[PDB]
From Swiss-Prot:
Induction: By cholesterol. Disruption phenotype: Cells lacking this gene show a slight reduction in the levels of cholest-4-en-3-one-26-oate, but the concentration of 26-hydroxycholest-4-en-3-one is not measurably affected. The levels of 26-hydroxycholest-4-en-3-one and cholest-4-on-3-one-26-oate are drastically reduced in cells lacking both cyp125A3 and cyp142A2. Pathway: Steroid metabolism; cholesterol degradation. It comes from Mycolicibacterium smegmatis (strain ATCC 700084 / mc(2)155). Involved in the utilization of cholesterol as the sole carbon and energy source by degrading the side chain. Primarily catalyzes the sequential oxidation of the terminal methyl of cholest-4-en-3-one into (25R)-26-hydroxycholest-4-en-3-one (alcohol), (25R)-26-oxocholest-4-en-3-one (aldehyde), to finally yield the carboxylic acid (25R)-3-oxocholest-4-en-26-oate. Also able to sequentially oxidize cholesterol itself, not only cholest-4-en-3-one. Its EC number is 1.14.15.28. This is Steroid C26-monooxygenase. Its cofactor is heme. Heme binds at C339. The keyword Heme applies. The keyword Transcription does not apply. One of its GO terms (molecular function) is cholest-4-en-3-one 26-monooxygenase activity.
Length: 401
């Protein structure tokens, strides 16, 4: 009943378990909430949707993060400039192109589960949830298998440095990582200008914007956007979502018995986990918006998890239900910047989860104590997730490789 006293840039807010109740207060008492530093946040589903549908008033050019300026990639652009960029990568993400990866992504899933299935235990995050989407986006970007871990670690070091509570060492680590990734990209630019390939990094390297080659800086940021979108998101729905299924074993059981229930489960896994906690918009004019006066140039945080637990929309949002139908979550955002990879992400979730259900049917949490969350203010989900299961046979290994 007391107003939350919070810093929405503090990663701890998103990790310590108190967000859900804080959101509830906001949605009921101050839909457009200003935190203790005065940072405005849209907390109701309707307020998020209203902001999303009016990009003219709620611009993306100011920078998607609350404490950083606009950067040279598509998510920090408004149309038509934004669309110019989407058209450069869209062909790689058509539904047909995504569905043609079923066999490939399936083998990655089977490979990872092969690695642990005979053990009777693994960490669901480290061994399953994190590596699969990394490999998938890596494959699209031409990344070699032995370099996946390097890029994944870089990605982790960038998004974990996103918090007002981290020390100068973490910030330095963030800068050094970005410089390392920059040098990586410069090598790729030189190589793919001379020897273009069919992968997405090569396509971006040789792409054109407004009559000229995409700039070096823009190539760095566009490729990095795709990499992080790929490897710091789906992982949290896989881990956090599977956790909810294991904690609602009736629902786990229904899924093990009927895979036709999996698509509905995936949407609830998405709604619940809401990997992207927020995205910023920049007001282009003074306005009053759902009870709060906003000023031009100020940013507002679109609070997607808060929106995804809006009682007025979902009825019973605090119940995890794989039978939730319809399920109009905004885990992928809405409108202009609606997630490029959302179909890829849904496929990853489907192909991996169906294999887990199938090959590890008696999976369960190793302990029932809290699954720790990453204290970061942007993307966040489970840090680790010990699980146990009856050992089972590999599907690739022992069956002719
Ligand atoms: C569960 C997985 C994912 C979640 C929850 C998620 C969430 C989001 C959200 C909330 C946005 C911003 C939309 C808005 O502001 O309205 C976004 C944008 C974006 N995402 Fe995803 N995403 C996921 C997976 C992916 C994957 C796998 C990729 C790439 C392979 C990707 C690439 C992008 C890109 C490029 C954008 C910018 C789109 C634009 O500005 O047009 N995302 N995502
Ligand atoms: C999840 C997906 C849809 C969005 C992913 C967005 C990522 C790619 C953004 C979020 C936060 C961003 C960083 C914010 C802050 C900085 C500091 C900046 O250093 S500065 O000296 O140029 O200010 C360099 C870019 C960098 C590292 C950004 C890289 C790019 C960055 C990781």
């Amino acid at each position: 009943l007391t107003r939350p006293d919070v810093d929405l840039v503090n990663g701890m807010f998103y990790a310590d378990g108190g967000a859900r109740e804080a959101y509830r207060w906001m949605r009921a008492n101050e839909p457009v909430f200003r935190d203790r530093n005065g940072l405005a946040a849209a907390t109701t589903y309707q307020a998020v949707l209203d902001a999303e549908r009016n990009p003219e008033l709620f611009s993306s050019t100011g920078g998607i993060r609350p404490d950083q300026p606009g950067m040279p990639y598509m998510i920090d652009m408004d149309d038509p400039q934004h669309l110019l960029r989407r058209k450069l990568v869209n062909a790689g993400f058509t539904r047909k192109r995504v569905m043609d990866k079923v066999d490939s992504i399936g083998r990655l899933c089977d490979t990872l589960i092969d690695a642990v299935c005979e053990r009777g235990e693994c960490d669901f995050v480290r061994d399953i949830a994190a590596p699969l989407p990394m490999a998938v986006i890596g494959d699209m970007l031409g990344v070699l298998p032995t370099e996946r871990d390097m890029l994944l670690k870089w990605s982790d070091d960038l998004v974990c440095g996103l918090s007002s509570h981290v020390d100068e060492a973490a910030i330095q680590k963030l800068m050094d990582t970005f410089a390392a990734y920059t040098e990586f990209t410069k090598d790729v630019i030189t190589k793919r200008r001379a020897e273009p390939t069919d992968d997405l990094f090569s396509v971006l390297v040789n792409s054109e914007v407004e009559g000229q080659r995409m700039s070096d800086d823009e190539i760095v940021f566009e490729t990095l956007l795709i990499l992080i979108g790929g490897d710091e998101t789906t992982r949290h729905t896989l881990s956090g979502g599977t956790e909810q299924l294991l904690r609602h074993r009736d629902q786990w059981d229904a899924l093990v018995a009927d895979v036709d229930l999996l698509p509905g489960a995936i949407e609830e896994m998405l709604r619940w986990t809401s990997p992207v906690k927020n995205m910023c918009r920049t007001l282009t004019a003074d306005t009053v918006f759902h009870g709060t006066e906003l000023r031009a140039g100020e940013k507002i945080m679109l609070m997607f998890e808060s929106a995804n637990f809006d009682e007025s929309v979902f009825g019973d949002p605090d119940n995890f239900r794989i039978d939730r139908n319809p399920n109009s979550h905004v885990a992928f955002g809405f409108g202009t910047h609606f997630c490029l990879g959302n179909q890829l992400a849904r496929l990853e979730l489907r192909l991996m989860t169906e294999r887990v259900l199938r090959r590890l049917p008696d999976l369960r949490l190793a302990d029932d104590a809290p699954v720790p969350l990453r204290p970061a203010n942007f993307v966040s989900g489970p840090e680790s997730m010990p699980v146990v299961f009856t050992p089972s046979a590999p599907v690739l290994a022992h069956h002719h490789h």
